[PDB]
Amino acid sequence: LQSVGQIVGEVLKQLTEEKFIVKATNGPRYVVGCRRQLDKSKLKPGTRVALDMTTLTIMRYLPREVDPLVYNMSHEDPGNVSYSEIGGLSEQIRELREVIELPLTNPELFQRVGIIPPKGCLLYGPPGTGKTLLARAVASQLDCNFLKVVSSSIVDKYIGESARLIREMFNYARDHQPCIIFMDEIDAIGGRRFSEGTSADREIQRTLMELLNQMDGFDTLHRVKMIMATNRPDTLDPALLRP
Amino acid sequence: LREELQLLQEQGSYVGEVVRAMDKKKVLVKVHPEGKFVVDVDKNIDINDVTPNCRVAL
Amino acid sequence: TKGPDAASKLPLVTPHTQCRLKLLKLERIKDYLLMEEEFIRNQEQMKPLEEKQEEERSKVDDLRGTPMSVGTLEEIIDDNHAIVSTSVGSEHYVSILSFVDKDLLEPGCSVLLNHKVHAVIGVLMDDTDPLVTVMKVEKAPQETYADIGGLDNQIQEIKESVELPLTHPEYYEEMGIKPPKGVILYGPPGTGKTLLAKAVANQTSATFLRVVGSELIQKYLGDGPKLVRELFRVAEEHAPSIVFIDEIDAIGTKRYDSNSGGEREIQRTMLELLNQLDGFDSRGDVKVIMATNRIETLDPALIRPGRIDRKIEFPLPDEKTKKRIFQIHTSRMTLADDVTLDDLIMAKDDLSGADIKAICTEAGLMALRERRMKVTNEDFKKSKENVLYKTPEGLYL
Amino acid sequence: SKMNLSDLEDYVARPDKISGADINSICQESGMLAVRENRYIVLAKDFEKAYKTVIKKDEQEHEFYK
Amino acid sequence: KPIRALDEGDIALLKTYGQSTYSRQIKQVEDDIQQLLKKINELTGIKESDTGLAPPALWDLAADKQTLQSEQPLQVARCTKIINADSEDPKYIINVKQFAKFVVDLSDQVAPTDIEEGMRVGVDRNKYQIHIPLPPKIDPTVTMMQVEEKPDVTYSDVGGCKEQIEKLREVVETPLLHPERFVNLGIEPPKGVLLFGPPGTGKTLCARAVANRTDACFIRVIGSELVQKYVGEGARMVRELFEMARTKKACLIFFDEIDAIGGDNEVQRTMLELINQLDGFDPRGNIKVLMATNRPTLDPALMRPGRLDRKIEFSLPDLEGRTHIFKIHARSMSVERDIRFELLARLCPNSTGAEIRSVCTEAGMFAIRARRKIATEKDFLEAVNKVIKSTPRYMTYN
Amino acid sequence: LVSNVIELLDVGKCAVIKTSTRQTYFLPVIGLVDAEKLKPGDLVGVNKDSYLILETLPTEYDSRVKAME
Amino acid sequence: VIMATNRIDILDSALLRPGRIDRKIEFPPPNEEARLDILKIHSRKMNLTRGINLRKIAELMPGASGAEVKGVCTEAGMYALRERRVHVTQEDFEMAVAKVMQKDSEKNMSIKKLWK
Amino acid sequence: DVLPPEADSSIMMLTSDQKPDVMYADIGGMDIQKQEVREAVELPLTHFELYKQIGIDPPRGVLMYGPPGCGKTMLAKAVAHHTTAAFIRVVGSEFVQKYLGEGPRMVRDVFRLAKENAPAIIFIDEIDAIATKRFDAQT
Ligand SMILES: Nc1ncnc2c1ncn2[C@@H]1O[C@H](COP(=O)(O)OP(=O)(O)OP(=O)(O)O)[C@@H](O)[C@H]1O
Ligand SMILES: Nc1ncnc2c1ncn2[C@@H]1O[C@H](COP(=O)(O)OP(=O)(O)O)[C@@H](O)[C@H]1O
Ligand SMILES: Nc1ncnc2c1ncn2[C@@H]1O[C@H](COP(=O)(O)OP(=O)(O)O)[C@@H](O)[C@H]1O
Ligand SMILES: Nc1ncnc2c1ncn2[C@@H]1O[C@H](COP(=O)(O)OP(=O)(O)O)[C@@H](O)[C@H]1O
Ligand SMILES: [Mg+2]
Ligand SMILES: [Mg+2]
């Protein structure tokens, strides 16, 4: 009963060592100081923070707001499915275990070898071949943050929302390392780029290139490995298909 | 400095668009977002100087 | 109710060669304006009349307080309490003081309320928010039916729709036909729809309201329909009146299932416009005029016979109408004797009234290029292809 | 440079329309295979196997097109 | 050829020489006229601006001040779920309009029986206690309503819907005025009927016609009215409407353009209220409902059997029907007594009844154009040429 | 005052809600209710001054799920 | 009011209508003389060398926009800068023209020989 | 008080930590491409007097095109690392927002921020997201 609750806002700028330009959500913006004991180094622009409702001072930082869709896709239990429950995938399951998990165990091994840990891999095959279950088992063995995402569920009529969702997915992944991005049915997003010009496929190309940037773009990726399963590997975009 | 300090402690005045000078003492003015009021005019401001659709201070 | 508006000064426009008949008439007008100025300055010079009641008015003002907020009387209850909405959108169950005119209280009329403990303390019959005040025409446009060339059928129809009911309407109820509530002009751009609206607003005897269509749409929730309601309420209050909504397709497009909030608000605003169009009886003396270029894109409910019976067509001018427009716009020019103007008209093209006006303007500019003002026929020759920018040659012969 | 000691010149000489991304792949895959076989210096066998794995370019093309 | 821009001497000579001798005087005079006009406009003032001040001796300024210092305002709200009070949890969550929503309790002056989901309630401002339920009242003055008890449209005023009017007769006249045949036949009288067709076919007035001959009051309710500004309370509105339908001896309840509702929180509230009113009210009653629409968008939960027993399609009028409509609308105008209305009805294929009325209106328009107090067949010919059709059909067909 | 619990964060738990006065609001302590179910969307009654979740109330609806009775 | 567009044909007819928009002025690509003038304005601040024939450079631009001419001047300056000099020579302008006006053509002779 | 002209910007820059670690040495080859980028993105920012002496405006804005995975985004990463300019990394698909007019507003905001800051660089990866050839859009 002695707590009064707090505003929530986003830090816009570090005006000086003490004055922080902070925008409250769906409201006005202020210049506000921070608490006496706080990690100003972690008060990066865009960092969601809390504000004392009376004195309007930076109270405590908050982890980045997560999209409800991303939250829902992020909190489905893998069900601790065991590697015994796969069936006859020994060489491929070993290869996948290598390319995903080994960077999550001995990066020193790779760096002494000198390779950059792999960013991710594609798992192509006919339907019912167990790609979803295989990835679920990989997550369960890892017991890490799992993002079971199906591509057909992120295309939207709202024009800039699909790429925004991809950005939110990858921002969540960067925030919650170690995370596993399992993008099922990737043929519904990366289906080659062509200039026929219909609006729908054009928006699909925009989403694909947003994925390509979020995946091997300017911002280098650390400790985030992706799994993309499809039934038509041959229609994938060459830019996405590239190493 | 003292005069500026004194005048700096008084609250700001809402700007508003005068709909019309209703009477010689009352002026219908719309101020965003409170709505529209019929305010009075202090001694200094002359009504005839108040024209419709001019920004005034309340 | 009150009376109409849109006062205008003398037509003048009987002479144009600046032959001092203009000067004499204008001097008479100026003399009358001077007597206006002097008379009112004298009347304000001596006019002692004030106080009288004072005390009762002073105490009623004290009761009202200062400031007083205006709201919309959305609904009434037993004759001491009512429901009033502030301009924000919040409405409250408030009390009604004795000194209010209980006959004036009706759903919609603006009510003066107390700033604290809201309570109806007055009624304002002239709210007329600045936007709708702007849409009301004050100075009649200088254009008139003399300036309109051709469109004789169109002028006939528009006068039979908006003037004949305003003037002697006995023919209408004598035949028993209800007057045409609302008229939509349409046609290719620059045919003369807005010009005809101007001419109507000139030779008028009713409050003329000019609207842009896109003007009605407003950012805030419910502001759109509220403004449309205010416009039509002003139309009824100052009836007889003519409500001209230019570019009706700014809102008149086909109604479709709205998804976003903004499109829902646009649908609400058009629904309110249609409801207001249905609200007043056609026997009422308020008419609407809507002009557009893309008639085919309008909702086929706005143009229903039960809502807008008439549909005036503004086709591209014919050769005789083309020469009429050329004569009209060349009236103020000092054309030479060599000019014929017939070659331009005879050329099979799609000239419009705007195109012909621009051709005349460009011919004048070409004449000014040669330091002359008599404007040869060669000036028009050049101007025609100067302003007319943009079938494969011998395919059709 | 970050690779192990390990004929890279011949591999360069091989005419293959491959980008720098493919070269980075080839090298990374060579390292990954060496990790699989538990040897800390790649050489002709695993490096060549990674090279084949990277630039597949398998036609699977019906011969009537050619 | 490079054209030369006008120089200062060029401009100066242009303004003179080829000028009327009276240029300066006329232009100056016009300028003073405009300036004097603006002078008069700014000086004439505004005037009252007369607030709604009652005539004196009607003023109780003492009591007015007493109310100002005693009575309090209440914000109104739309009350929502009752939270299953049962006298121990009387709180309800109420939405004060564009303001927030609060879970609150009652004032001592109101019993919970007076408060129910979806009614407008006036509440205080800090405790937000529901102080008084605010029923939206029912009156034909507000909105539009039935505004009719015995319509003036008779069976002679309807044409082109002989099969449709026969079906409507079986729907309404047979159970209402002849309940004995349905009773002894042991068949439930038609609980629900829908009247679908293109707009302007005549549908509404057809029901109105039978509404005059069914010896029951006609009810007009517009779906757009339920969906426009009069949304929300509309459910309660129709509640009261259905309630008054129970009060009268027989009501011909009919909803105009149900497409605005049949195809939305408060809209769904009004729908479910309609469902409760229909499925709840005993089908043996005498307030049988007539349903009509233009777009057969109706929710599948509606036409399930037991809610809409019959469907009637109102197609475009035929030659006999169109000529009947022409004669009907000519009865109300000054025309000659030898007009070949069969000719005109032939000249208007696939024309709506409203189109026929507009055609008659345009015939009168053309008669007025020639200032002839009697419209001629030529006038109707030009009217149909104008309205209908909005060389090809004569140089190939003959 | 009604409010939609935006989500729950860890610090031994904190919350962030969105009140019906279109305002987001961080609570270091989740009022006077339990803290397990608390769905991100669970409408709650939060105090009108000190802004802590005083009670939980049943969900309103899911739009179209109300459309079908 | 002045308006600009690269695509006049797609503008609304109600906007291109005269009285709303008069004198639909077209800006064609500069001809040889005009290209020479444009080169001379954009080479005004350069450090030219004696024996420079800007007329030849303008002739080296079949149907080049003025922006391309300014880009050619900039690229010639860049070529001079590469050799850490301040003057620019004729060959600098020639290779600047080659670089700036370079465009991909139809590689397939078979496609290019469809038309006579 | 008055704030810096564009402090309250929705779009953020490249902070010191966000700067990538790729160096110009890590980019094998591409000597001519490195030179042609540096001549317009690095040299004018540090050797303006060199351009002024020749009396020419330095090239402003460069397109980097070619087959995928040939070094474009890495060259941009290196340029961001090896520069004193304020770097605004954006991607074409990021510009396309949901609400009408928000995309152009973001473009205006980005360029305004770059203008109000020091000599700055705007890198827009995947420009063909938004800059495809214009056509008669019908929706
Ligand atoms: N019949 C006419 N006679 C003389 N002038 C005409 C005529 N028709 C059009 N004009 C000229 O065209 C100009 C523009 O016309 P107007 O504003 O009425 O266009 P409009 O046809 O309503 O087109 P839009 O609505 O597409 O702008 C007028 O100022 C007038 O000078
Ligand atoms: N190794 C496997 N290969 C194929 N299917 C499997 C395997 N193991 C389990 N399954 C079955 O596949 C089902 C899950 O669908 P799954 O095949 O994983 O999705 P996908 O269509 O992506 O392959 C499980 O119910 C399970 O019975
Ligand atoms: N010149 C090069 N030097 C070193 N590595 C390179 C080179 N070119 C490509 N690579 C490798 O390929 C990838 C190239 O990505 P990049 O070419 O920037 O993508 P895009 O071309 O789609 O922007 C890098 O991750 C790098 O590992
Ligand atoms: N059978 C009919 N008898 C008489 N008038 C008709 C008939 N059908 C249509 N009309 C005419 O059509 C006009 C509009 O009919 P209305 O009932 O409003 O159409 P809707 O059925 O779409 O409501 C009426 O004014 C009426 O004069
Ligand atoms: Mg016009
Ligand atoms: Mg890239």
Side-chain angles (χ1 to χ4, degrees), chain E residues 214-240:
Chain E
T214 42
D215 322 87
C217 90
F218 163 69
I219 313 296
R220 157 177 280 193
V221 185
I222 279 166
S224 86
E225 175 257 296
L226 267 54
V227 86
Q228 59 214 169
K229 59 184 81 160
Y230 331 92
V231 78
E233 104 285 359
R236 150 65 36 104
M237 212 57 168
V238 315
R239 176 109 48 200
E240 293 209 322

Side-chain angles (χ1 to χ4, degrees), chain E residues 156-292:
Chain E
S156 177
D157 206 60
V158 279
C161 287
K162 294 308 298 310
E163 68 281 19
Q164 332 285 13
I165 193 61
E166 159 229 353
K167 296 194 64 52
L168 251 203
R169 283 243 328 278
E170 319 153 35
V171 177
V172 61
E173 285 206 356
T174 61
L176 222 56
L177 259 303
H178 314 60
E180 69 282 358
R181 56 162 31 81
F182 275 103
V183 164
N184 62 25
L185 195 33
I187 174 58
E188 175 59 48
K191 167 145 170 172
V193 293
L194 182 272
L195 278 68
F196 60 115
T201 312
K203 298 173 296 313
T204 318
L205 66 101
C206 313
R208 271 184 66 252
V210 85
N212 168 272
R213 295 297 306 113
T214 42
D215 322 87
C217 90
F218 163 69
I219 313 296
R220 157 177 280 193
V221 185
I222 279 166
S224 86
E225 175 257 296
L226 267 54
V227 86
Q228 59 214 169
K229 59 184 81 160
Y230 331 92
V231 78
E233 104 285 359
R236 150 65 36 104
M237 212 57 168
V238 315
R239 176 109 48 200
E240 293 209 322
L241 166 139
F242 227 85
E243 190 41 67
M244 70 49 51
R246 264 67 64 92
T247 74
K248 307 303 296 307
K249 86 299 171 194
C251 279
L252 198 143
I253 164 63
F254 155 65
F255 296 82
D256 316 59
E257 54 163 351
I258 205 51
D259 319 64
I261 295 313
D264 285 6
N265 323 77
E266 292 94 285
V267 154
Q268 178 48 235
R269 266 140 209 158
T270 60
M271 160 96 168
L272 61 92
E273 155 74 327
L274 258 299
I275 294 301
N276 304 140
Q277 290 168 155
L278 266 308
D279 298 79
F281 147 91
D282 61 302
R284 197 54 196 82
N286 46 55
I287 61 180
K288 197 43 68 195
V289 51
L290 286 296
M291 194 25 43

Side-chain angles (χ1 to χ4, degrees), chain E residues 81-359:
Chain E
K81 76 169 64 172
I82 309 307
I83 221 66
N84 61 298
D86 317 85
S87 173
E88 87 280 329
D89 307 324
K91 78 205 64 190
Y92 328 118
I93 77 88
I94 67 179
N95 188 340
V96 287
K97 45 206 99 93
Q98 83 283 18
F99 207 13
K101 326 143 157 56
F102 319 91
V103 30
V104 305
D105 219 318
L106 290 307
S107 310
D108 73 324
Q109 55 178 303
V110 61
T113 52
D114 323 284
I115 303 300
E116 40 101 347
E117 204 283 321
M119 51 162 30
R120 262 160 63 256
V121 315
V123 317
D124 66 78
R125 299 221 215 167
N126 81 45
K127 295 307 297 182
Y128 289 135
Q129 295 278 94
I130 292 189
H131 260 67
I132 172 71
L134 292 196
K137 200 216 298 186
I138 176 58
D139 45 309
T141 53
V142 77
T143 80
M144 38 43 57
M145 207 35 48
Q146 34 93 25
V147 306
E148 180 47 89
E149 314 300 327
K150 186 66 59 189
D152 44 46
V153 280
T154 192
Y155 281 173
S156 177
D157 206 60
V158 279
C161 287
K162 294 308 298 310
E163 68 281 19
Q164 332 285 13
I165 193 61
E166 159 229 353
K167 296 194 64 52
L168 251 203
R169 283 243 328 278
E170 319 153 35
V171 177
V172 61
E173 285 206 356
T174 61
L176 222 56
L177 259 303
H178 314 60
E180 69 282 358
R181 56 162 31 81
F182 275 103
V183 164
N184 62 25
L185 195 33
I187 174 58
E188 175 59 48
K191 167 145 170 172
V193 293
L194 182 272
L195 278 68
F196 60 115
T201 312
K203 298 173 296 313
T204 318
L205 66 101
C206 313
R208 271 184 66 252
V210 85
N212 168 272
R213 295 297 306 113
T214 42
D215 322 87
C217 90
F218 163 69
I219 313 296
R220 157 177 280 193
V221 185
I222 279 166
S224 86
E225 175 257 296
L226 267 54
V227 86
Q228 59 214 169
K229 59 184 81 160
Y230 331 92
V231 78
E233 104 285 359
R236 150 65 36 104
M237 212 57 168
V238 315
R239 176 109 48 200
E240 293 209 322
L241 166 139
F242 227 85
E243 190 41 67
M244 70 49 51
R246 264 67 64 92
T247 74
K248 307 303 296 307
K249 86 299 171 194
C251 279
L252 198 143
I253 164 63
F254 155 65
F255 296 82
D256 316 59
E257 54 163 351
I258 205 51
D259 319 64
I261 295 313
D264 285 6
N265 323 77
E266 292 94 285
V267 154
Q268 178 48 235
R269 266 140 209 158
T270 60
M271 160 96 168
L272 61 92
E273 155 74 327
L274 258 299
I275 294 301
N276 304 140
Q277 290 168 155
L278 266 308
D279 298 79
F281 147 91
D282 61 302
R284 197 54 196 82
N286 46 55
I287 61 180
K288 197 43 68 195
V289 51
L290 286 296
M291 194 25 43
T293 174
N294 290 344
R295 283 282 307 111
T297 76
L298 300 315
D299 63 273
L302 194 54
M303 309 55 60
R304 41 148 303 290
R307 265 171 221 176
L308 288 90
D309 167 72
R310 277 167 155 170
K311 337 288 165 292
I312 315 101
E313 212 312 313
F314 278 33
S315 61
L316 291 179
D318 215 346
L319 199 43
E320 50 274 38
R322 298 193 298 275
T323 207
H324 190 183
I325 306 322
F326 250 110
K327 308 230 289 283
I328 277 172
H329 300 352
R331 300 188 198 289
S332 165
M333 32 201 313
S334 87
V335 295
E336 298 113 24
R337 300 325 167 203
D338 46 47
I339 297 293
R340 297 202 291 284
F341 294 101
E342 39 268 66
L343 202 177
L344 300 173
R346 158 175 91 87
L347 265 276
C348 311
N350 309 294
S351 174
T352 36
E355 215 142 309
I356 314 183
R357 183 215 43 238
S358 62
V359 164

Side-chain angles (χ1 to χ4, degrees), chain G residues 24-109:
Chain G
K24 294 158 224 316
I25 302 183
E26 168 164 43
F27 284 60
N31 41 0
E32 167 181 343
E33 317 85 16
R35 281 191 297 276
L36 180 59
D37 312 74
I38 299 166
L39 267 155
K40 282 205 300 309
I41 315 108
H42 290 302
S43 50
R44 146 207 48 183
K45 273 185 303 313
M46 320 225 80
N47 288 33
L48 264 305
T49 64
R50 298 73 146 150
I52 276 285
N53 183 286
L54 288 176
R55 161 71 53 84
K56 280 177 168 168
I57 297 313
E59 292 162 0
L60 257 56
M61 311 228 177
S65 87
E68 256 141 38
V69 171
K70 162 146 158 284
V72 148
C73 294
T74 288
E75 284 304 325
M78 278 339 270
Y79 274 169
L81 171 138
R82 288 226 187 108
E83 307 161 8
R84 249 53 188 196
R85 344 174 299 201
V86 198
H87 56 297
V88 312
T89 88
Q90 180 87 352
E91 71 150 348
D92 268 344
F93 269 71
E94 303 163 49
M95 341 201 276
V97 162
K99 157 193 296 175
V100 152
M101 291 286 330
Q102 159 43 0
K103 61 100 173 169
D104 293 318
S105 170
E106 208 46 85
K107 319 297 210 194
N108 198 339
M109 169 88 280

Side-chain angles (χ1 to χ4, degrees), chain C residues 193-194 246, chain G residues 17 20:
Chain C
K193 309 167 269 197
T194 310
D246 208 355
Chain G
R17 154 173 93 77
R20 249 192 282 262

